[PDB]
Amino acid sequence: QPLRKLCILHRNPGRCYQKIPAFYYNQKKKQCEGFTWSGCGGNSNRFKTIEECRRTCIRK
């Protein structure tokens, strides 16, 4: 079964300069790699912990 949409909308931080650094699911590595969120923009794929990321991005 496939993963949720939140794990494939692509980690778009936004145009606003660094403010919520966290992680995103890297579809090469196949684990949540770190990504820096901007300030006032972006899509989703925001995950604080790698496990929490994988719960949704790897499936239960």
Swiss-Prot record:
Tissue: Expressed by the venom gland.
Membership in a protein family: Belongs to the venom Kunitz-type family.
Gene Ontology CC annotations of this record: extracellular space
PROSITE patterns listed in its UniProt record: BPTI_KUNITZ_1 (PS00280), BPTI_KUNITZ_2 (PS50279)
Protein name (database record): Kunitz-type serine protease inhibitor homolog dendrotoxin I
UniProt-annotated location(s): Secreted
Species of provenance: Dendroaspis polylepis polylepis (Black mamba)
UniProt keyword Isomerase, yes or no: no
Pfam families reported in the protein's UniProt record: Kunitz_BPTI
